[PDB]
Each structure stands twice: as C-alpha cells, then as structure tokens.
Amino acid sequence: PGATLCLGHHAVPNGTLVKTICDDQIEVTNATELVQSSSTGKICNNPHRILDGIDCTLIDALLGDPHCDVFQNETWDLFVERSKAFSNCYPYDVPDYASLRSLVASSGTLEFITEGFTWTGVTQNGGSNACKRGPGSGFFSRLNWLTKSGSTYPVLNVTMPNNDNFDKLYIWGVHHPSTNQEQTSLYVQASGRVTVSTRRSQQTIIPNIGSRPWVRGLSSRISIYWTIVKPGDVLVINSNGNLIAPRGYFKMRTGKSSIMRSDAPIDTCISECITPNGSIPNDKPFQNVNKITYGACPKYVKQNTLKLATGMRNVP
C-alpha cells in the first residue's frame, strides 16, 4: 500500500474583497478597514480641555460683552464656537479679525490683569443702551470709554512699562461717530486721532465720521486694534478723542491651544482626536470625517474606505 501526505491552507465561508497591484478586487480570508468614516456626533471633553462658547464668540468674550463675562480669565485647550452665537454690545468691527481670533485661540487663555492707567481730564467708564448690563446702560468690561470733561477733552498721554517676564496683550479701540454733532459732543475736537506704539512699532488711526448700517440702535462703530508688548519694552498711548482705552492686558501664553467651529453637543467620554462632527477614534491611520481636526488624529483622505488584507487568498 503506502500513504498520502497532502499540504494545504485554511479558508473561511465568507471572505472579504481587497484591492492589490494585480487585482482590482480579490478575495482574502480577512481584512481590516483603514479609513475612519463615522463619529458618535459628540465632542468628548477629555483628555483635552474643552470650553463651550455657547452664545459667545471668542472675540466677544475677550472684549467683555456682558452676557459673555462668565468667560473672564478662562482657559481652554479647545474653544468651541457655536453657529447660534450672537453679539449684544456696541456694534464694532475688527480689521484683521481673523488674526486676533487666531492668536487668542493659540494663546489659550483670557487671563486679564487690570493696570492702574491714569486718564487725566476725561470722563471714564462710558456706556450705552446698545450694550445693557442688567437693567442699566453699560460697556465692554475690558475697555474704558473716555469722553470729555467739562467743555474740553485734552491730549491724553500715558505710558505703561512691561516689567514682567511675559508678553502682554493690550486690547484697545477707536470710536467712529455717526455725526459731526456726536463727534464734538463727546470729544470736543472736530477730529480726534489715536496713536499707540512700542519701541519698534507704531499704529495711528484716524476716526471717520459718517453713518454705517443701523445696528442695535447705533449708526456708529468702534474699530478694535491690539498691541503686544514684550518684557523690557513699553506702551505709549496718545489721543485727543475717540479713544477706547484698555483697562489692562491679557497675559500671553504658548502651547497646544486652538479653536473650532461646531454644533456638536459636548459629552462626557474620552477621545484624543476632535473634529467638528464630534470626536473620532484614532486607531486607524486615515479618516474621512473632516479635514479640520484637533489633537492626535488620523490623516484626512478623500477615500471613504480602504481595506488592508490581514489574511491569505480565500479559496473555498
């Protein structure tokens, strides 16, 4: 007689199709998905520190719109801006809005330190019924609206040295009145001017009188500007009207902080990777959820699926 000895390999009843160099579709015993294509729909609040902006943008929180003052001195790894956000204070614009938003998001804190600026010969703490705080008139919390004292508005001239070992962010502004009557009523001078400088920088802004579209009762505007002062440098502020003064400075930080736009709810759970759609797992090398991401995240690709064979050819 004798014997027979046969060699073989396993197979399974289903099997999965993958693509190769030589086959557009070939059946293997097993494969694994390399593209993350789903989200729970919630942003996980750990391990990164999430701050939900609710009704507030980061810029509105910075300036101190009253319904946003809850955010005073706050910090975040990720600031979440909601599409439902709204402003409820003096109508304003920010030349280079995007840059201020970017640098604050990156700084990662709203820590604010009041300084004892002296404002001689003007009325301080101006307010408006466009920016109500409780039942009465009010203003941005971090800014100081200066107006005339008696029948005059003198040349303001103040300085603030940086004797700390961190960078200071100063936020300040310029008022654009809607009428000539308004300009002279507030500031006496028919035209003001504001110049703020450091030892290697300078900014001069001339207010512009005229109407803009009516917003929250006002046809006037404030333009917001900012100046960073390094250790050993110094701030100088010079104005004869229309100046919206700082009350102090924001402490600058460096680190991993950023900002994201999302309407995703915030859940209690853990994920390293955050997208506007919600958090996603990062076990796969690629993802098709969003090109916008934060944290330890799969790489964004266009494909919605890619299969890596994890077994031999399936030959049942």
Partner 1 sequence: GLFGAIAGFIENGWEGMIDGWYGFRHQNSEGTGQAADLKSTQAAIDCINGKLNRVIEKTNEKFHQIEKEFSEVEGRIQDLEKYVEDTKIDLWSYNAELLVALENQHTIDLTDSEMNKLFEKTGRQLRENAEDMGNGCFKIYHKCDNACIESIRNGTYDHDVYRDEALNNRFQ
Ligand X SMILES: *[C@@H]1O[C@H](CO)[C@@H](O[C@@H]2O[C@H](CO)[C@@H](O)[C@H](O)[C@H]2NC(C)=O)[C@H](O)[C@H]1NC(C)=O
Ligand Y SMILES: *[C@@H]1O[C@H](CO)[C@@H](O)[C@H](O)[C@H]1NC(C)=O
Ligand Z SMILES: *[C@@H]1O[C@H](CO)[C@@H](O[C@@H]2O[C@H](CO)[C@@H](O[C@@H]3O[C@H](CO)[C@@H](O)[C@H](O)[C@@H]3O)[C@H](O)[C@H]2NC(C)=O)[C@H](O)[C@H]1NC(C)=O
The rounded distance, in Å, linking the Cα atoms of 208 and 192 is 9
If one asks whether residue 13 binds a second copy (CB under 8 A), the answer comes out as: no
**Per CB under 6 A, does 180 bind ligand X?**
no
The least CB distance from residue 44 to ligand X, in Å, is 45
- Our finding on whether 219 is near ligand X (CB under 6 A) is yes
Distance of CA 153 to the CA centre of its chain: 36
Q: Which of residues 266-285 bind ligand Y (CB under 6 A)?
A: 276-277
Angle value at C-alpha 21, between 19 and 24, nearest 5 degrees: 40
179 binds ligand X (CB under 6 A): yes
| DSSP code at position 45 | E
Contacting ligand Y (CB under 6 A), which of 290, 300, 306, 307? 290
Q: Which of 9, 200 has the CB closer to a second copy?
A: 200
Min dist. Cβ of residue 201 to a second copy (A): 6
Q: Should residue 159 be labelled a site residue for ligand Z when binding is judged by CB under 6 A?
A: yes
CA distance 151 to 264: 54
| Tokens standing for residue 169 | 């962010």
Do the beta carbons of residue 251 and residue 113 sit within 8 Å? yes
Binding mask 176-195 for a second copy (x = CB under 8 A): x----------------x-x
**CB nearer ligand Y, residue 32 or residue 198:** 32
Measured in whole angstroms, how far is the alpha carbon of residue 52 from the centre of its chain?
Answer: 11
- For residues 37 and 290, give the distance between their C-alpha atoms in angstroms, rounded to a whole number: 9
Contact region for ligand X (CB under 6 A) — 86-94, 118-126, 211-219, 283-291? 211-219
- By CB under 6 A, tell whether 157 contacts ligand Z: yes
CB atoms within 10 A of CB 70: 11
Residues 37-56 that bind a second copy (CB under 8 A): none
Among the listed residues 117, 181, 182, the one whose alpha carbon sits nearest the alpha carbon of residue 144: 117
- Interacting residue ranges for ligand X, rule: CB under 6 A: 157, 159, 178-179, 211, 214, 219
